[PDB]
Amino acid sequence: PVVRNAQGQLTHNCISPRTLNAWVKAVEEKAFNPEVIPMFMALSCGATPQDLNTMLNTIGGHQAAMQILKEVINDEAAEWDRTHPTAPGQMREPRGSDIAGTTSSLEEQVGWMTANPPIPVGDIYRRWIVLGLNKIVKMYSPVSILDIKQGPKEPFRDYVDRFYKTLRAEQASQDVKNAATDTLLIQNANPDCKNILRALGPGATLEEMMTACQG
Amino acid sequence: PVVRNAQGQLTHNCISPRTLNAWVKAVEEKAFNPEVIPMFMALSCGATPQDLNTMLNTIGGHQAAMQILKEVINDEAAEWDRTHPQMREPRGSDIAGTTSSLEEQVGWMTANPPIPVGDIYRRWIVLGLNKIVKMYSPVSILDIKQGPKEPFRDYVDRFYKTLRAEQASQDVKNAATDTLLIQNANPDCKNILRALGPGATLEEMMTACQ
Amino acid sequence: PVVRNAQGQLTHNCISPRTLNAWVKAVEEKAFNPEVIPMFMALSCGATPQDLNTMLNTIGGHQAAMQILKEVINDEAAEWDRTHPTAPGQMREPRGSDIAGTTSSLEEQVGWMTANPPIPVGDIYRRWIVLGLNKIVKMYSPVSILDIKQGPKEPFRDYVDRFYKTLRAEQASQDVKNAATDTLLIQNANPDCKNILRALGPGATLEEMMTACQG
Amino acid sequence: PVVRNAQGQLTHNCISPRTLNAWVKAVEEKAFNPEVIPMFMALSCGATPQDLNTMLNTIGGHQAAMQILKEVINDEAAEWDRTHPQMREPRGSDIAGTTSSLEEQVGWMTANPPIPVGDIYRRWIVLGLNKIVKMYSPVSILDIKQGPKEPFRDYVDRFYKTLRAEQASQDVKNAATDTLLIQNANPDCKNILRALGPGATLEEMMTACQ
Amino acid sequence: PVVRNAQGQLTHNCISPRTLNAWVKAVEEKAFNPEVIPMFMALSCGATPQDLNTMLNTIGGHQAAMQILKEVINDEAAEWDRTHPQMREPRGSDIAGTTSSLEEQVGWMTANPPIPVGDIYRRWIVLGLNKIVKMYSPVSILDIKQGPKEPFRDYVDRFYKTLRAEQASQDVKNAATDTLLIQNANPDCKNILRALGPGATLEEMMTACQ
Amino acid sequence: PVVRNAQGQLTHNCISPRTLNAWVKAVEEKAFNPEVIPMFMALSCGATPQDLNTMLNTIGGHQAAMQILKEVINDEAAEWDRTHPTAPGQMREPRGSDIAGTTSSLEEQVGWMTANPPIPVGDIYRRWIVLGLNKIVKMYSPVSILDIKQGPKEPFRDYVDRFYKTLRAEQASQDVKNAATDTLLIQNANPDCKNILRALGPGATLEEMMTACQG
């Protein structure tokens, strides 16, 4: 990664074993549940493209997903080159493949990230990777929201947990609550809780619905 | 987070893997037991709004609770905007890190004078966590009754653990909760506690039923 | 905590996850055995009142003990206010509730701890907490020294271990050896070892008693 | 390794116990799966030849592979000496850290201009690791065939894992491997994949057989 | 402990959680095996008396041993006071950290010239630990005899482990312990060891009975 | 150990608990397999003689090996004194027992290691220790290369692994491949693989032999 030392200047540091092992274990434990994306963003903080490739390449399984991620990176790369056609001791401009760390050296990557003004090739590449991870998370979501239905003896809290977890994966995003998803939550509740939720009438908050079906 | 380096100057650092893993494991182990709030406050020390969103977003389960937390944040956001018509002034959505950049967040937190958007957002999150802790509290204090063979210490432990979760708070001891602790004790210990008379300390009650 | 940076000046640092997890695990493993107090003193080194409250508040069980600790803190607080009745840019004097971190901000706590001269509100509060932990350790000591008696086939070393562990908890303190506890150690030994210990005569050291009952 | 301290100057540090243990555990867990190469490149960042030899020498098993690695290093060493007749110039055996001191290695790596003997040696080691990864690849891509009840995603996972090991490389997707992926699919999924027509993306194939 | 920061100046730091946990775990795992003394010396490096008391006080079991240790410390304290009638001079109880403040301890350890009260107290503690190690040594060297089917290496391991604990020390090899090692060997290996003749090295004895 | 601080000057640091625990665990796991030597060299980097004695003394078992190591150290010590017979504020010259940290203080050891010019007593002692560890590794090698023979159903890769692991321990060294060890590898292969290896003819590489017996 690129960080400020105690002298306050930008400098390259080797990716830490702790950071790398945390990412490898995140992928092993969480697969492509939607929470893997925020973990990726946190652990890749300050990353060079070289660091980002290290993080993706150290993954041993999920090679179908890693090939889907490469298609997305190549698409984002081509789009960058399309919208960016092309002084002594200054950097050549970065191509798509330079941002993805394929055709760029570490020295060039750090050069761009510490140039005046900076070209944050690390942050641009991280954005492309997250677009690919979002796509994988939606593809791998195992159950449609249409089939998330409260079991006849499933507590309402456990049903609401499954419901909002499914919406988060299908949208690769937690901005999923609104008047219409409230209606779907009620539609897919079991007969007992459904009858109770309808009697609350319109505009019932999640707190009030969860309280009303708790007994 | 924003911290003082060894040169003593305020600067942004990446959230540490250790800190992130500690929070994720706290939530996995402790669910929404009341002690998760002090753990949240400790592990979010010096946090930017961006760091606070990282900590909440890395939680994979409890998505019902995460939506309750968002409603509370949005309420606190609207209230901030209502009471507040080099840096542009922050809106509610800037404090919650939705419409603000890292650069803006660090700008505000290191401005003269500082606008601690990190500490303001942490306050809103704790309000939401308190609400979740009370919602998830499984047992009313009314149902905490000493078993016929339960040591008094084990009953007092269950009693004050229940008050803490029901009130998302440990300022639960007073003359009336003392009365309820006595009321719900088993006949043997209840008879002993009454004979102490009024105003008995917790030490004296726990000594007398030991 | 408050520490000296490499420039040698006093500054606040966030409590470390390692420190917090060590305290939480100390309490989970050691309950209120007397060794929890020295662990508390070591892990709370440089602590602000805010840090000390973090350490106590992160404990999930033992809420009977945590309420006993609060009674003791409130007593120490009232006593401070009793014995301390009440320039531009200097600190207001601390009340009991400011030392316990209830009515004081972090900024005020660090202010006091780095004032000329310093008011060590962290060290004053730690003292109050240790008085509360001492009281809990004595209350929770499960066996009176009167009932620590060598089993008929218990090795003498194991009996002496139980004896001095009990004295440490009942006094919340390891200054427990003297001519009279030597006499009690002999009184409560099994008939075989008791007969051997009496024949040593007066003034026998612990080494000599432990050697004499080893066979 | 040779790194910049907080004063921003290049200096030698002892290899860290954490780094060494991470590499030893990577080799124990992952054997010569292709992902061991990127782990090697990450954990050897800033390495001197001395550090690289430490990392290879601390491996206790796989001594057949360690001798294959040495043959490759000796080949790269001879090739360097062939193409290269304050610091004396480095020989192949100086880059591999056999005939060079730490002082010489750090000298070269911090010279104006620098001779990155660490990065040159790491390149030779990766060439050797690639060779081992292909030798140890247990299954030909020709034998990766979708089971009659195997989900397509699990078959695609096995297919691209096999190409990666057979080629010690993840640049394995192209029009002809797409054709082989279809050829080796089960009858049901094969019939679906053919009806998509030519040029179907991996996303579209994986969606269609889901 | 008192250490040099990166500015190269002597300053007090809080004992680290890692160091404390390492010592507590050393005592839990190794009891009073002789190797606990070198572990104590390593983990107490730069310790103030306050730090040394923290390390001893955090031990929860072995309270018989902890009282033996205190008798030895009090003996060394009295002896110091006997031979020693800006900083006031330290008494025995000041070196053991009973009657001295942290400020005084750091004062002495950073005085010109320094009075290393930390190193003096560590010496007294090691004297006490040596005494405990010998008391707890479970087997006399006289009872270490090679089994009829015990490999010689396993017998030599038990022999030198026993001498180390009996003497709280690894300077145990000499012409007379060589003679005892031979005397207590099994008949087969004893006959072989005698035929080597006098002055045989440990290498040659271990080779001959292999 | 002795290291450069961020001011770039040589200074003593306490041995780290992590470093010590890594060495103790290396010895517990790897015994005296030949890879323990490179682990010893890595973990003892920058060590004073005092640090090196800490590392050896913290080992609880293997006391036969620790006495063999002491014989070798004493031999290297005597040899140093033989080949080194003997200004204000400069260091006395080191004896063998000063390099081994027996008759030298930490202050003297750091003095020598930071003298102009330096006497690297740490690196000299580490060399003596490695000579002792090499000797132990050869002594403890459990099987002669003469008895490493491919099992009738042992895969060739597993046989070659055992073969080169044995040569490494018997030479305490991995410079073990050459035309004659190639001949011994063939001699000791099972009849099936032996017949295949002979038909390759002379000069066959290890890659070609391992490929030819893989089926």
Distance CA B151, CA B170 (A): 22
Distance CA A64, CA A70 (A): 10
CA-to-CA separations, E62 to C206, D12, F84, in angstroms, rounded: 13, 44, 49
DSSP A173: S
Structure tokens belonging to residue B83: 């009471």
Structure tokens belonging to residue D47: 């390495």
Question: If DSSP states are collapsed to H, E and C, what string results for A67-133?
Answer: HHHHHHHHHHHHHHHHHCCCCCCCCCCCCHHHHCCCCCCHHHHHHHHCCCCCCCHHHHHHHHHHHHH
DSSP C141: -
**Burial state string for F17-38 with b = 16 or more CB within 10 A and e = fewer than 16:** bebbbbbbebbeebebbbbbbb
| Method in brief | X-ray
Taking CB atoms and an 8 Å cutoff, what residues of chain D touch F46? 14
Determine the structural domain holding residue B99 and report its residue range.
2-136
Check if the beta carbon of residue E132 is closer than 8 Å to that of residue E46: no
Q: Name which of D8, D18, D35 is nearest A59 (Cβ-Cβ).
A: D35
Q: What is the CATH number of the domain that holds E47?
A: 1.10.375.10
Strands F2-4 and A10-12 turn out to be unpaired
Would you call F115 exposed, middle or buried from its count of C-beta atoms within 10 A (0-12, 13-18, 19+)?
A: middle
Closest residue on chain C to E7 (Cα)? C6
CA-to-CA separations, B41 to A186, B17, B106, C15, E47, in angstroms, rounded: 35, 17, 19, 10, 32
Taking CB atoms and an 8 Å cutoff, what residues of chain A touch D45? 14-15
What is the Cβ-side half-sphere exposure of residue C40, based on CA atoms within 13 angstroms? 28
Distance CA A71, CA A87 (A): 35
B172 C-beta neighbours (distance < 10 Å), count:
18
Q: Give me the helix-helix angle, C63-83 and C121-140, nearest 10°.
A: 130
Give the CA diameter of chain E: 70
CB proximity E173 to F under 8 Å: yes
DSSP A91: P
Residue type (1 letter), C148: I
Cβ separation E67–C1 shorter than 8 A: no
CB proximity D206 to F under 8 Å: no
Closest residue on chain E to C34 (Cα)? E60
Question: What DSSP line would sit under F47-114, residue for residue?
Answer: --HHHHHHHHHT--S-HHHHHHHHHHHHHHHHHHHHH----TTSPPPPPHHHHTTSS--HHHHHHHHT
Check if the beta carbon of residue A118 is closer than 8 Å to that of residue A46: no
* Three-class secondary structure of residue E121 per DSSP: helix
Cβ separation D170–A63 shorter than 8 A: yes
Which of F10, B206, F63, A211 is CA-nearest to residue C138?
B206
Which of E109, E112, E111, E82 is CA-nearest to residue E95?
E109
Q: Which of residues 138-157 of D touch A (CB under 8 A)?
A: 153, 156-157
Q: Please, after which residues is chain E broken with C–N above 2.5 Å?
A: 85
Structure tokens belonging to residue B190: 């209840």
Residue recorded with tokens 């009341």: B34
Phi, psi of A111 (to 5 degrees): -45, -55
Structure tokens belonging to residue E37: 């003394």
Top residue of A57, A69, A141 to mutate, by most chain D CBs within 10 Å, is: A57
Q: Name which of A15, A59, A67 is nearest D202 (Cβ-Cβ).
A: A67
Check if the beta carbon of residue D48 is closer than 8 Å to that of residue D1: yes
Smallest CA–CA separation between E21 and chain C, in Å? 8
Check if the beta carbon of residue C19 is closer than 8 Å to that of residue C51: no
Distance CA D68, CA B209 (A): 75
Which of C118, D18, A25 is CA-nearest to residue F17?
D18
Structure tokens belonging to residue A70: 């490469």
Distance CA E18, CA E15 (A): 9
A28 C-beta neighbours (distance < 10 Å), count:
12
Closest residue on chain A to D173 (Cα)? A67
In the beta sheet, which residues pair with residue F3?
A: F11
D1 C-beta neighbours (distance < 10 Å), count:
19
CB proximity C29 to E under 8 Å: no
Closest residue on chain C to E128 (Cα)? C207
Cβ separation B46–C14 shorter than 8 A: yes
Would you call F50 exposed, middle or buried from its count of C-beta atoms within 10 A (0-12, 13-18, 19+)?
A: buried
Distance CA D200, CA D206 (A): 10
Cα A141 from chain centroid? 14
Cβ separation F63–E173 shorter than 8 A: no
Cβ separation F61–E157 shorter than 8 A: yes
Cβ separation F71–E38 shorter than 8 A: no
CA-to-CA separations, F82 to F69, F76, F85, F96, in angstroms, rounded: 20, 10, 6, 9
End-to-end CA distance of chain D: 48
Cβ separation D5–F3 shorter than 8 A: no
CB proximity E67 to C under 8 Å: yes
Which of F181, F163, F183 is CA-nearest to residue D65?
F163
Smallest CA–CA separation between B75 and chain C, in Å? 26
Top residue of F33, F164, F170, F182 to mutate, by most chain D CBs within 10 Å, is: F164
Closest residue on chain F to E1 (Cα)? F14
Residue type (1 letter), D55: M
Cβ separation F42–D15 shorter than 8 A: yes
Q: Which chains touch C (3 or more CB pairs under 8 A)?
A: B, E
Q: Name which of E1, E41, E156 is nearest F64 (Cβ-Cβ).
A: E156
Cβ separation D57–F46 shorter than 8 A: no
- Resolution reading in Å: 2.0
Cβ separation B58–A39 shorter than 8 A: yes
Q: Which residues contact F78 (CB under 8 A, 6 or more apart)?
A: F96
